[PDB]
Design an enzyme around this catalytic site. Structure first.
Site, PDB file in Angstrom:
ATOM      1  N   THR A 195      52.332  18.509  64.218  1.00 13.89           N
ATOM      2  CA  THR A 195      52.616  17.473  63.224  1.00 13.89           C
ATOM      3  C   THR A 195      52.400  17.914  61.792  1.00 13.89           C
ATOM      4  OG1 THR A 195      52.247  15.165  62.518  1.00 13.89           O
ATOM      5  CG2 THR A 195      50.322  16.357  63.249  1.00 13.89           C
ATOM      6  N   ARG A 196      53.134  17.271  60.891  1.00  9.76           N
ATOM      7  CA  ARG A 196      53.037  17.546  59.466  1.00  9.76           C
ATOM      8  C   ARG A 196      52.995  16.233  58.690  1.00  9.76           C
ATOM      9  NH1 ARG A 196      58.383  16.493  59.352  1.00  9.76           N
ATOM     10  NH2 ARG A 196      58.363  16.050  57.115  1.00  9.76           N
ATOM     11  N   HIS A 200      50.659   7.674  63.105  1.00  9.36           N
ATOM     12  CA  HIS A 200      50.637   6.220  63.158  1.00  9.36           C
ATOM     13  C   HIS A 200      50.534   5.803  64.618  1.00  9.36           C
ATOM     14  CE1 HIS A 200      51.590   6.138  58.942  1.00  9.36           C
ATOM     15  NE2 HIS A 200      52.681   6.857  59.147  1.00  9.36           N
ATOM     16  N   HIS A 203      52.693   7.638  67.348  1.00 12.08           N
ATOM     17  CA  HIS A 203      52.161   8.925  67.729  1.00 12.08           C
ATOM     18  C   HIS A 203      50.919   8.840  68.630  1.00 12.08           C
ATOM     19  CE1 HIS A 203      54.370   9.095  63.913  1.00 12.08           C
ATOM     20  NE2 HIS A 203      54.849  10.236  64.381  1.00 12.08           N
ATOM     21  N   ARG A 289      61.453  13.704  69.160  1.00 12.15           N
ATOM     22  CA  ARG A 289      62.743  13.632  68.477  1.00 12.15           C
ATOM     23  C   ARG A 289      62.750  14.413  67.161  1.00 12.15           C
ATOM     24  NH1 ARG A 289      66.846  10.669  65.366  1.00 12.15           N
ATOM     25  NH2 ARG A 289      65.253  10.947  63.728  1.00 12.15           N
TER      26      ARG A 289
HETATM   27  N1  LIG Z   1      59.150   8.521  67.340  1.00 11.63           N
HETATM   28  C1  LIG Z   1      59.013   9.730  67.916  1.00 11.63           C
HETATM   29  N2  LIG Z   1      59.514   9.939  69.165  1.00 11.63           N
HETATM   30  C2  LIG Z   1      59.400  11.128  69.788  1.00 11.63           C
HETATM   31  N3  LIG Z   1      58.770  12.128  69.158  1.00 11.63           N
HETATM   32  C3  LIG Z   1      58.247  12.002  67.920  1.00 11.63           C
HETATM   33  C4  LIG Z   1      58.359  10.776  67.249  1.00 11.63           C
HETATM   34  N4  LIG Z   1      57.778  10.931  66.090  1.00 11.63           N
HETATM   35  C5  LIG Z   1      57.311  12.168  66.004  1.00 11.63           C
HETATM   36  N5  LIG Z   1      57.594  12.817  67.123  1.00 11.63           N
HETATM   37  C6  LIG Z   1      57.211  14.211  67.415  1.00 11.63           C
HETATM   38  O1  LIG Z   1      55.907  14.452  66.858  1.00 11.63           O
HETATM   39  C7  LIG Z   1      55.819  15.840  66.499  1.00 11.63           C
HETATM   40  C8  LIG Z   1      55.462  15.996  65.002  1.00 11.63           C
HETATM   41  O2  LIG Z   1      56.141  14.987  64.235  1.00 11.63           O
HETATM   42  P1  LIG Z   1      56.311  15.106  62.644  1.00 11.63           P
HETATM   43  O3  LIG Z   1      55.025  15.404  62.008  1.00 11.63           O
HETATM   44  O4  LIG Z   1      56.991  13.901  62.111  1.00 11.63           O
HETATM   45  O5  LIG Z   1      57.257  16.303  62.336  1.00 11.63           O
HETATM   46  S1  LIG Z   1      57.370  17.732  62.812  1.00 11.63           S
HETATM   47  O6  LIG Z   1      58.177  18.507  61.648  1.00 11.63           O
HETATM   48  O7  LIG Z   1      56.027  18.354  62.956  1.00 11.63           O
HETATM   49  O8  LIG Z   1      58.121  17.702  64.091  1.00 11.63           O
HETATM   50  C9  LIG Z   1      57.174  16.427  66.857  1.00 11.63           C
HETATM   51  O9  LIG Z   1      57.207  16.957  68.181  1.00 11.63           O
HETATM   52  C10 LIG Z   1      58.105  15.258  66.814  1.00 11.63           C
HETATM   53  O10 LIG Z   1      59.353  15.474  67.485  1.00 11.63           O
HETATM   54  O1  LIG Z   2      55.495   9.915  56.089  1.00 10.74           O
HETATM   55 CL1  LIG Z   2      54.219   9.362  56.547  1.00 10.74          CL
HETATM   56  O2  LIG Z   2      53.725   8.475  55.529  1.00 10.74           O
HETATM   57  O3  LIG Z   2      54.406   8.587  57.766  1.00 10.74           O
HETATM   58 CA   LIG Z   3      71.132  11.292  63.534  1.00  6.43          CA
END
Ligand SMILES: Nc1ncnc2c1ncn2[C@@H]1O[C@H](COP(=O)(O)OS(=O)(=O)O)[C@@H](O)[C@H]1O
Ligand SMILES: [O-][Cl+2]([O-])[O-]
Ligand SMILES: [Ca+2]
Ligand SMILES: Nc1ncnc2c1ncn2[C@@H]1O[C@H](COP(=O)(O)OS(=O)(=O)O)[C@@H](O)[C@H]1O
Ligand SMILES: Nc1ncnc2c1ncn2[C@@H]1O[C@H](COP(=O)(O)OS(=O)(=O)O)[C@@H](O)[C@H]1O
Ligand SMILES: [O-][Cl+2]([O-])[O-]
Ligand SMILES: [O-][Cl+2]([O-])[O-]
Ligand SMILES: [Ca+2]
Ligand SMILES: [Ca+2]
Ligand SMILES: [Ca+2]
Ligand SMILES: [Ca+2]
Ligand SMILES: [Ca+2]
Ligand SMILES: [Ca+2]
Ligand SMILES: [Ca+2]
Ligand SMILES: [Mg+2]
Ligand SMILES: [Mg+2]
Ligand code: NA
Ligand code: NA
Ligand code: NA
Ligand code: NA
Ligand code: NA
Ligand code: NA
Ligand code: NA
Ligand code: NA
Ligand code: NA
Ligand code: NA
Ligand code: NA
Ligand code: NA
Ligand code: NA
Ligand code: NA
Ligand code: NA
Lengths: 510, 510, 255
Positions: A195-196, A200, A203, A289
């Site tokens: 995650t980055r 919430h 997650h 996703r």
């Molecule tokens: N609503 C969601 N449904 C399925 N997977 C999610 C969802 N939100 C986040 N994820 C997953 O959570 C992980 C980290 O999410 P993010 O921090 O937003 O972005 S990421 O660049 O690190 O992928 C990733 O595997 C992403 O695909």
């Molecule tokens: O982009 Cl984060 O504030 O969910």
């Molecule tokens: Ca799309």
């Protein structure tokens, strides 16, 4: 699982007894020195600690091109993101194979000694197109053309020490340390969550479901190295993670910071992430996703399909040697108060709800109330605190070049006017004199919440030193944020225009 | 009552038809120009509008010395504070009697034409001792020796316009305008309340009692010109006044801002204040405890007796021609929930309560809760907002000279460390390079709530450019705010020392 | 159970009487605390009965009352232990007490003061405040004294318009009584209803008894005026400010 390649390349451990010697060579006045760029510091740390096993240095041309065109190292090992040491022509010209360079941090802390294997000039267009899909707006491609050096230096490393960090000393666990952590706990099944963004409710549910499906403990493994431009800073995110981790049942989750420098490279990055987490001791890795996806470009089209990463990861399944737990869009179910994968509902029979990050910023920037169901309160609190609503934001009003009135008087008028509103904001007439040492401070003030009244524009050659954020141009030009009727419009009129504009954009609330 | 001297000297009115002509002379390239200092701007405005009737210019030596030694103008008119135009030797030497000088504001707006009567060199020690009681710490004395010019220019004025103000345009009523205000309302009895501090419950009661005793309407006539150093700014105070005025019964009070420049001259000033309020249309003037008094000196002794002003005002009673409503220490009565003059209670039979301004700052600086009985909530809110508690205050840590460790690395360490705490504060490693244009910004950031890490001290000749406020010195010296064990103490040690020190002083709260 | 008894506030004798009455009603025991059926003190501050006279009298008829009496000494509050107890089984200075007399209880009720959580239950204080509102919700009358020389018609209007601008739910009215008792007898009804009345003239002394003195103030030059005027012809705005500030001082108005 076994580290990728079979051997954890923890070079800090490997080169331990060479520590003193390598340090002396590093500080010897004869050796050539390169001061690592931020992204390189991230990479160098993952190479020296085994996180990028099997790597043991920055890719030479042979391995580099193999990764660009084959998603594999020259020897066939599965690897999707090229890790190179990018330098400029000047420095590139002073090195030849067999040469030994000292790699420093902040031109002061010696990190490692790189033994040169080759110096090549990559075709950034190919890398951009084969590795990052070509779109000029893609974060990785913009970095490659605007920040990265035009020369790569392949070569092996000998570790002196991982890059220096004074924040979160306890939390940045190395692969060796994490594995020990899991062991002391007798954790033989651990599903890692990349995650980055701040986590919430969706997650938390997403990770627990994974924990339940995989019958494994949870490893929140967030990136605090380098992510998508405009992301929430890692300090705030760390506070958020530390807070949300408490909503997990006692002893089910572990938190560890990963100093990775993402490329926002969707599917390929997903593969890379899985390899990385495997080295770190995980037995499972989540892929939801649009994993590692940078969303859409200015034209509204997707950089990656919302499930390209899942498909790619699926295709390398038998050789990743770490089990991937895939997830489809996890969303909110009003009527039942609970989240659930969209793949196991809908049919219109069920109504969902989803607050995109976009609209999330919107409420944060507008002091709007963020749903109890969407995120935990303690979390939203930390976020608003780091990203205050407009009435607590700083800003600048720049008196346009076209301005005919007395800039001195219009300045004071605005100052005295803003001053009577009160609300804790600090104000200042700020004269920059085109000195970049002053210009570079403009965003510091805005960041501190202050309101600046700038009587003159800065020459266009300096425009880059100033962050465009919350900086408004008061002028007769059409490109002015606050357009004046005439260059000599009377002060009180200009003043009302400025005040009402700021009021309209939430900076002032009466 | 009739303005002091019998004739309101509203020179703006008087010189109206000379406006254009005076304006031309003012901007003619031949005339000599003096740019008015801030205090002079306050005085000039009270002279041109009639506020200082019978004055019509800055005191010549004859009137000046008569005021110093006699509390009267040369002609006998009761007048206790010398109003003079102080300049430097350089300027003083370019003028002789009969000469006409143009008085400007911000070296841009012409205010008036002063016809010189004389140029003298006052003995600041006599003025300091006879007028302000001699103590070197007295605000007026300090100004006289450290800011005032060493030459005075007596002469008559011819008004072009009152000094420019862009804040509170409607509220800075002139004597002529106030009188009209009172008339439109058929107010023939008006008791004026002077003040330089925010008004709390005691004051509201004090003023209503006076309204009841005198059978008169209430005029809140606060100073927004220049007051005691370290006072709450007038913008915040004006917000406080506008808020507290609502606690009065409908149509009993009127608010008007007085651009007076106080001298904090206790009893003499009280006489002066009463003369000024009479010119402004008041029929009564309040004189409470230690009126216009600057409290105590560093040695704890009083600059004035708590009732010297009352005694002095009482002695000139028959010629002030404005009735004085005296008040003894108004204090709080817990057991009966009400305030009352201390002169009509005590006997131990009754228990009082009094939150001095001192301790008031203390809670404001410590986020402490301020009593419901002491001040109205909406008021405390405005105050807290302008003077936030420590956890929202800015500060600087200056890396002492004795420091032997890498300043670059110690700076980064502190930055990263503070960054992990979160709480909305903005941080920055700030390099000044002894450039005053940067040094002068240090307090701006602190004012904006930011935390600054300064790697080096500034040369002693510049120390004056920086406000000592919330600026701490980290060093081995005994005069260091944060004392180090040795100049080469390891970073983590120094960091813990700085963090705990700041935590101890409330800047951080966990 | 409600007892339609008409008390005589006769301390000890009444206590005996009360016990006889409770026995008829089926009680086997009757409480007799401090100053039972006592009317407190007279204008001179002396007690009508001793705080325990009733207990002594009841004790002396004990064998023929044929209903057992449960006597109680001053029950008071114990801060430090959060509990009440008979004063007869504590004190010694070793313990600090607390007691909110009914007197001071009216005081807070009349001044909107907060009444201690320990003293009474909240739902109870609520019912009390509601029946006996604080001054800012109380009615009142301003009677334009006889000595008044100004236009009563204009002074009345001035006060009306003035009070009207304050707002706060109070209803106002210039009330002309014409010495008719059918109107006079209504004065306290309005005050009871929370209204403010401006009465342009006094009522003849023979009628004074028809009007309840409660919250009725006299504006006049006389020394016996609740709101004393400087002169009978003081200008209206002056008289108005005097009346407003007086009412503000007595809590009827809060800004
Ligand atoms: N609503 C969601 N449904 C399925 N997977 C999610 C969802 N939100 C986040 N994820 C997953 O959570 C992980 C980290 O999410 P993010 O921090 O937003 O972005 S990421 O660049 O690190 O992928 C990733 O595997 C992403 O695909
Ligand atoms: O982009 Cl984060 O504030 O969910
Ligand atoms: Ca799309
Ligand atoms: N507690 C008090 N009792 C009597 N007078 C008071 C009290 N507090 C303030 N005052 C009076 O209020 C007026 C203005 O108060 P301040 O703003 O604090 O100070 S001053 O410098 O303008 O005199 C003065 O007449 C002062 O003496
Ligand atoms: N604090 C107290 N201690 C002892 N007895 C009390 C106390 N307060 C009230 N009582 C008793 O409660 C009963 C009724 O109290 P009240 O209604 O106040 O007055 S009474 O007129 O009916 O006696 C009486 O027996 C009275 O003495
Ligand atoms: O009353 Cl002020 O000193 O805050
Ligand atoms: O007097 Cl009563 O207890 O309210
Ligand atoms: Ca290039
Ligand atoms: Ca024009
Ligand atoms: Ca001097
Ligand atoms: Ca004293
Ligand atoms: Ca040492
Ligand atoms: Ca008694
Ligand atoms: Ca008369
Ligand atoms: Mg590290
Ligand atoms: Mg002005
Ligand atoms: Na350096
Ligand atoms: Na191409
Ligand atoms: Na499995
Ligand atoms: Na696709
Ligand atoms: Na395996
Ligand atoms: Na709009
Ligand atoms: Na007069
Ligand atoms: Na200028
Ligand atoms: Na008087
Ligand atoms: Na004295
Ligand atoms: Na006189
Ligand atoms: Na301390
Ligand atoms: Na007795
Ligand atoms: Na019997
Ligand atoms: Na009173």
């Amino acid at each position: 699982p076994a580290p990728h390649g079979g051997i954890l390349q923890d070079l800090i451990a490997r080169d331990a007894l060479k520590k003193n010697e390598l340090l002396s060579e590093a500080q010897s006045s004869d050796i050539l020195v390169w001061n690592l760029t931020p992204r390189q510091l991230c990479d160098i740390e993952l190479i020296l600690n085994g996180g990028f096993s099997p790597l043991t240095g920055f890719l030479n041309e042979n391995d580099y091109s193999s990764v660009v065109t084959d998603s594999r190292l020259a020897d066939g090992t599965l690897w999707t993101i090229p890790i190179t040491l990018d330098v400029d022509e000047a420095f590139a010209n002073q090195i030849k194979p067999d040469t030994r360079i000292a790699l420093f941090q902040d031109d002061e802390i010696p990190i490692a000694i790189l033994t040169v294997q080759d110096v090549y000039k990559p075709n950034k267009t190919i890398e951009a197109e084969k590795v990052f899909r070509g779109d000029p707006e893609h974060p990785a491609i913009s970095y490659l053309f605007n920040v990265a050096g035009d020369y790569y230096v392949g070569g092996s490393l000998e570790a002196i020490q991982l890059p220096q960090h004074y924040d979160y000393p306890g939390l940045r666990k190395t692969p060796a340390q994490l594995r020990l952590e899991f062991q002391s706990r007798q954790w033989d099944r651990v599903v890692a969550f990349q995650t980055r963004n701040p986590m919430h409710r969706a997650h938390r549910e997403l990770t627990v479901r994974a924990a339940r499906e995989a019958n494994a403990k949870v490893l929140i493994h967030p990136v605090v190295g380098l992510t998508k431009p405009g992301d929430i800073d890692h300090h705030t995110r760390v506070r958020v993670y530390q807070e949300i981790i408490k909503r997990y049942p006692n002893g089910i989750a572990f938190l560890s910071l990963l100093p990775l420098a993402m490329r926002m490279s969707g599917d390929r990055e997903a593969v890379w992430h899985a390899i990385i987490r495997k080295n770190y001791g995980a037995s499972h890795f989540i892929v939801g996703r649009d994993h590692a996806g940078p969303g859409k470009n200015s034209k509204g089209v997707d950089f990656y399909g919302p499930y390209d990463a899942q498909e790619l990861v699926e295709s390398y399944k038998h050789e990743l040697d770490i089990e991937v737990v895939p997830f489809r869009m996890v969303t909110y179910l009003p009527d039942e108060d609970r989240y659930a994968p969209i793949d196991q509902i809908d049919t219109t029979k069920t109504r969902t709800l989803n607050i995109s990050g976009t609209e999330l910023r919107r409420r944060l920037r507008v002091g709007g109330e963020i749903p109890e169901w969407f995120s935990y309160p303690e979390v939203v609190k930390i976020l608003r605190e780091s990203n205050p609503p407009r009435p607590k934001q700083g800003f600048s009003i720049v008196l346009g070049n076209s301005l005919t009135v007395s800039r001195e008087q219009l300045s004071i008028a605005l100052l005295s006017t803003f001053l009577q509103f009160g609300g804790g904001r600090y104000y200042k007439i700020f004269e920059h004199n085109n000195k970049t040492e002053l210009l570079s401070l403009i965003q510091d003030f805005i960041g501190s919440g202050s309101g600046l009244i700038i009587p003159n524009q800065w020459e266009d050659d300096k425009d880059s030193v100033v962050g465009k954020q919350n900086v408004y141009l008061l002028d007769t030009s059409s490109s002015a944020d606050i357009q004046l009727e005439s260059a000599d419009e009377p002060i009180s009129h200009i003043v009302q225009k400025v005040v009402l504009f700021l009021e309209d954009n939430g900076f002032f609330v009466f």
